[PDB]
Amino acid sequence: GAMGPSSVSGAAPFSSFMPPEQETVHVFIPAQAVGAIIGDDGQHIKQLSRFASASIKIAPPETPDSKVRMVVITGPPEAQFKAQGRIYGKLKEENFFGPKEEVKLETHIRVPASAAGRVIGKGGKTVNELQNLTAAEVVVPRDQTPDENEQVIVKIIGHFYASQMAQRKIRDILAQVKQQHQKGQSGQLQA
RNA sequence: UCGGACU
Known part of the structure; x- marks a missing residue:
């Protein structure tokens, strides 16, 4: 739903869309932890996109395993290392299961x-x-x-x-x- | 020495 006529035709058609054919890992966090990651104005997870330099997609309650949510980390080892560790540590800081438990995610x-x-x-x-x-x-x-x-x-x-x-x-x-x-x-x- | 397990 972007009805931009695009009447301006420059010699340099800057395409603002990027194809995420990058290295894609799927790691899941407990649904309670998802609230900490996504909860921040509903955009903090999308902030991870630019931060970890990756295409961040979050799974809705689609799959029957909706007791957890799979995160789609599409990016280079840069994003793999950064985003994975970032969310992993985030579960710890959020005192969900960090002080009295070790965060155990499945990558x-x-x-x-x-x-x-x-x-x-x-x-x-x-x-x-x-x-x-x-x-x-x-x-x-x-x-x-x-x-x-x-x-x-x-x-x-x-x-x-x-x-x-x-x-x-x-x-x-x-x-x-x-x-x-x-x-x-x-x-x-x-x- | 490139097998198959551990959940």
């Missing part, structure tokens, strides 16, 4: 189905390593349960410092797997 990151059992380490090894030492609990889907685009989602349950280290290591191994797949023997023992 969904994009992993290829062909590497689902790879990011979990050599048989749930990354879970043991990251949970015990880093306090980052990493969980994968049962076997894979893949999307047609061979997409699976792996969850990070922990704390800001842990989650960042975990998601970095996961994508670290992950990326190098796909590279090894391409620049190698694909996935067969022929020679």
Whole structure:
């Protein structure tokens, strides 16, 4: 509903719209915590957009899991690190579940189905390593349960410092797997 | 040494 005639035609058609084809993570916070993030004039979450340099979209009560709300963080690692830690710490400052409890969010990151059992380490090894030492609990889907685009989602349950280290290591191994797949023997023992 | 677990 923007009926702008646009009669002005400059040699430089400055397009004010931006396509968020950036790295998109989905992390959810309890519905009570959503009130703290969104509640501030209903724009503080949208402030995160420019602040974290990302396209911030908030989930309405659409999905049956509406006991929580999934936030759509579309942006580079800049936004991933900034927004994720920002909201994570925000749950702490808001004295919801911070002084008497540790904030435990679930970050969904994009992993290829062909590497689902790879990011979990050599048989749930990354879970043991990251949970015990880093306090980052990493969980994968049962076997894979893949999307047609061979997409699976792996969850990070922990704390800001842990989650960042975990998601970095996961994508670290992950990326190098796909590279090894391409620049190698694909996935067969022929020679 | 690239498998599958832990919820």
